Write a protein that binds this ligand. Structure first.
Ligand code: 9GM
Ligand code: MG
Length: 156
């Protein structure tokens, strides 16, 4: 009675992968942290069980990927290329469900502009969503959009 979606969250250290996952799950912002999580949620009339790995037999079996950088961490943005190449390598495909997420939108120290990010996402043929795990802006959007990209890609 529920559709399972296996989602994987990837990106450089400190970008807020856990904090995003934890917002989605417990609607709380964790300043201080350090596996798999489940969330049941209705998306467009379908009861979904999200199976989320916050980072292989999850890399190879993942159905969709959130590729996260922080908008105040130019390196993390530059690293996205590597993570996308990694995902492509495991799946012999240039069409893997994926969303580029620019996190920490609440912070003032912004070194990656919305147009760099938009340009990168356009080149890959994927959505870009800006988030803050702190304020919760964009978080549901990012996960719901990923679910929708998986459905666009294959029957579920
Ligand atoms: N203002 C603000 N701060 C944020 C936001 N999101 C996270 N933070 C902050 O950075 C955290 C570090 O993020 P984590 O979730 O642990 O990062 P991971 O990518 O999981 N690292 P790893 O497990 O690969 O080592 C933490 O100091 C603080 O909560 C956000 O949106 N805004
Ligand atoms: Mg983490």
């Amino acid at each position: 009675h529920m559709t399972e979606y296996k989602l994987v969250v990837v990106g450089a250290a400190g970008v807020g992968k856990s904090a995003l996952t934890i917002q989605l799950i417990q609607n709380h912002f964790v300043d201080e942290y350090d596996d798999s999580y489940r969330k049941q949620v209705v998306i467009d009339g379908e009861t979904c069980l999200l199976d989320i790995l916050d980072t292989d037999q999850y890399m190879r079996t993942g159905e969709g990927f959130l590729c996260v950088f922080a908008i105040n961490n130019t390196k993390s943005f530059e690293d996205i290329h590597h993570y996308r190449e990694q995902i492509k390598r495991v799946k012999d495909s240039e069409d893997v469900p994926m969303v580029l997420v620019g996190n920490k939108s609440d912070l003032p120290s912004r070194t990656v502009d919305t147009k760099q990010a938009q340009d990168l996402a356009r080149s890959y043929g994927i959505p870009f969503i800006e988030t803050s795990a702190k304020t919760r802006q964009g978080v549901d959007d990012a996960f719901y959009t990923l679910v929708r990209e998986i459905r666009k890609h294959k029957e579920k």
